[PDB]
């Protein structure tokens, strides 16, 4: 019976590939061939945030493009004032091995997790004047990879075990579980409408989930190695991924295909972070090489390079207004970059 | 300061107090030594941490930590639990530990090659190149019984054992048969050959022959960490 099921799966995959090929009438690079080049993107380190003792794994921006949060393996969360380089908060964690950060869109809560299979939520605005842990979510059986807030009472997590979960913070229970991948889910991106989200796992595939229905909609399977980063196009109709192989790729929700690859012969390292510009024409990716490359989304070209850090770049984010880019790295320093 | 409002000055003062607390945390972070304990299900590292506990919890607990002191030096050992088989992703979090403690059950030859492949992967990893390995070849009494019985043979799984002869320069334990010494030296030589095949300059392996009754493993870890720190100091102080 197994052989018949495998044959049926092969036939279904073949017909899906045929359907995808039928829609590939033209390439993205062909259409954007006559478009004007972006030019050269020069950026300078406006601020450098110091104070972490160990390497930084994650950072997140506040909805007001002024406040940050960052995690290090010292077991510490620091909230920064990016304008004045002031440390607003410093939160000690129970477990040193923290892998991810999240900032609530309202700004009242911050979450984190790591090798301990728990997501801990902290109340930033209490009447006692201190930051205290509000809830511990303890359902995953593997290390916690990514966290993303939906509201003050909803959060989506991806974990080392193949599942992803949606939680109710007040009750502390898994409202939904997403069980499609066959490897460690490494990244997670929320859609602008927050009705869908995408994930990239340690297989070469990415999946589009429905938050309310709690089921997978599409699979994209374009890379060659483990996917480490994922991000949404600002339109919400496309997304980009970074993988252990040197390439970065742009995928399309509506056409169910892959649009363009961002690779060069001199790059033989893996991409750790991926982010888009506010207009969507610039793609920023961090690398195992200690630099960060700016890419032209419409035409696969390297517009500029961010060459400040002297260790592996681990995290990367762009503010909601598109004013600045923050880059974290394994040398325990954060840098804010801006144009001219 | 100039062009700062009173609230701005108070915020700067709060940030400075936070930095002071961060420095106080940094001193303690620098004091202690962090170790990562690895092994298989038959290695017996549970007994090793049990005997480290002499020196002084959710069901899905991702990491177990034990602490102990040798000569007023604090050690933090981290044991991985409730994790999946794939280690390629969560092993990168331990790229700054002082040393890796690898525990091997040398009694059974069926899974010795699996341990050798694990050692190869740990030694040759890109992010674990700097880390030194303290190798414990556990269960010496069981191996001695297995080699005295004569029922099981090492040449079945390692054909080069017949061509191996124990070195003329050796330090066998008193009352130990030559066959036990030959088996132990061959088993250790496999791991030592793997270690010295590449990357000998950056990091060093420290092989030991331990057992369940042995109570000197803490001192061995202390001495090996002392040597690791000595080598790091030689590198840092422009001596080399």
């Amino acid at each position, epitope marked *: 019976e197994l052989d018949q099921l495998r044959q049926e799966a092969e036939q279904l995959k073949n017909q899906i590939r045929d359907a995808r090929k039928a829609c590939a009438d033209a390439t993205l690079s062909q259409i954007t061939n006559n478009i004007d080049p972006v030019g050269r993107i020069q950026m300078r380190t406006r601020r450098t945030l110091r104070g972490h003792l160990a390497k930084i794994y994650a950072m997140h921006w506040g909805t007001d493009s002024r406040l940050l949060v960052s995690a290090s393996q010292d077991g510490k969360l620091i909230i920064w004032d990016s304008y004045t380089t002031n440390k607003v908060h410093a939160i000690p964690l129970r477990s040193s091995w923290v892998m991810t950060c999240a900032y609530a869109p309202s700004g009242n809560y911050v979450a984190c997790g790591g090798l301990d299979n728990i997501c801990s939520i902290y109340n930033l605005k209490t009447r006692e004047g201190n930051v205290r842990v509000s809830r511990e979510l303890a359902g995953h059986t593997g290390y916690l990879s990514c966290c993303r807030f939906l509201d003050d009472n909803q959060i989506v997590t991806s974990s080392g075990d193949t599942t992803c979960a949606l939680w109710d913070i007040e009750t502390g229970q898994q409202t939904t579980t997403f069980t499609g991948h066959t490897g460690d889910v490494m990244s997670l991106s929320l859609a602008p409408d927050t009705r869908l989200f995408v994930s990239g796992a340690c*297989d070469a595939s990415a999946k589009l989930w429905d938050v309310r229905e709690g089921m997978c909609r599409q699979t994209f399977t374009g890379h*060659e190695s483990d996917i480490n980063a994922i991000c949404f196009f600002p339109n919400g109709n496309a997304f980009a991924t970074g993988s252990d192989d040197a390439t970065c790729r742009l995928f399309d929700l509506r056409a169910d295909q892959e649009l363009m690859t961002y690779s060069h012969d001199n790059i033989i390292c893996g991409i750790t972070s991926v982010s888009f510009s506010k207009s969507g024409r610039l793609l920023l990716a961090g690398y195992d090489d200690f630099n960060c490359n700016v890419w032209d989304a419409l035409k696969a070209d390297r517009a500029g390079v961010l060459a400040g850090h002297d260790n592996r770049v681990s995290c990367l984010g762009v503010t909601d207004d598109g004013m600045a880019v923050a880059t974290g790295s394994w040398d325990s320093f954060l840098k804010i970059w801006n144009g001219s | 300061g100039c062009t700062l409002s009173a609230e701005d000055k108070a915020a700067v003062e709060r940030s400075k107090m936070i930095e002071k607390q961060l420095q106080k945390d940094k001193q303690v972070y620098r004091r202690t030594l962090r170790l990562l304990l690895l092994g298989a299900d038959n290695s017996g590292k549970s007994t090793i941490v049990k005997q480290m506990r002499i020196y002084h919890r959710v069901k899905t607990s991702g990491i177990f930590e034990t602490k102990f002191q040798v000569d007023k030096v604090n050690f933090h050992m981290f044991d991985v639990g409730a994790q999946r*088989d794939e280690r390629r992703k969560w092993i990168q979090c331990f790229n700054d530990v002082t040393a890796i403690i690898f525990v091997v059950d040398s009694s059974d030859y069926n899974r010795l*090659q*699996e341990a050798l492949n694990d050692f*190869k*992967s740990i030694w040759n*990893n890109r992010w674990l190149r700097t880390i030194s390995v303290i190798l414990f070849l556990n269960k010496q009494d069981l191996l001695a019984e297995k080699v005295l019985a004569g029922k099981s043979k090492i040449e079945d799984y*390692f054909p080069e054992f017949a061509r191996y002869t124990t070195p003329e320069d050796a330090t066998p334990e008193p009352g130990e048969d030559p066959r036990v010494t030959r088996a132990k030296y061959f088993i250790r030589k496999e791991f030592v050959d793997i270690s010295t095949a590449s990357g000998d300059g950056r990091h060093i392996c420290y092989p030991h022959f331990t057992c369940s009754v042995d109570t000197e493993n803490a001192r061995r870890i202390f001495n090996d960490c002392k040597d690791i720190i000595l080598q790091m100091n030689l590198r840092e102080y422009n001596l080399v």
Partner: nanobody
Framework: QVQLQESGGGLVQPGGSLRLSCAASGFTFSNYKMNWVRQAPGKGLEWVSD????????SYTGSVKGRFTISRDNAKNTLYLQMNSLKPEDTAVYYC?????????????????????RGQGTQVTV
């Protein structure tokens, strides 16, 4: 779409010979180190052989050393394993494993219970 299909296999008399092939697609064969692993009935997966990107470095397990030969054809995107003088202890399901990342010496989880870059295997019976 990373795919690995193994071809050779079948019933073998003791002292016989076999030749396994592993046609690979969905990735650049030249940049990756390749492995051969097997799972005897009632046992876990065992690493059998290994070969580097150019074939310069080759490694075998002691149980099969001197009888098995591993080779790769980077132009044809295929991996080979010549099995000479088979024994009744060699009855297993042989898998063609791919190293997780390119340009690296180390392969981590090729023998893990669920590995993404491994084939579906072929049955060899002696």
């Amino acid at each position: 779409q990373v795919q690995l299909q193994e071809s050779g296999g079948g019933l073998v008399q003791p002292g016989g010979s076999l030749r396994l092939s592993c046609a690979a697609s969905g990735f650049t064969f030249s940049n990756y180190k390749m492995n051969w692993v097997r799972q005897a009935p009632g046992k876990g997966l065992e690493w059998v052989s290994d070969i580097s990107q150019s074939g310069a470095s080759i490694s075998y397990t002691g149980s099969v050393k001197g009888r098995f030969t591993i080779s790769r054809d980077n132009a044809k995107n295929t991996l080979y394993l010549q099995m000479n003088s088979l024994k009744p202890e060699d009855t297993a399901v042989y898998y063609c494993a791919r190293c997780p990342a390119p340009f690296t010496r180390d392969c981590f989880d090729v023998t893990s219970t669920t590995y993404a870059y491994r084939g579906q295997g072929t049955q060899v019976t002696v």
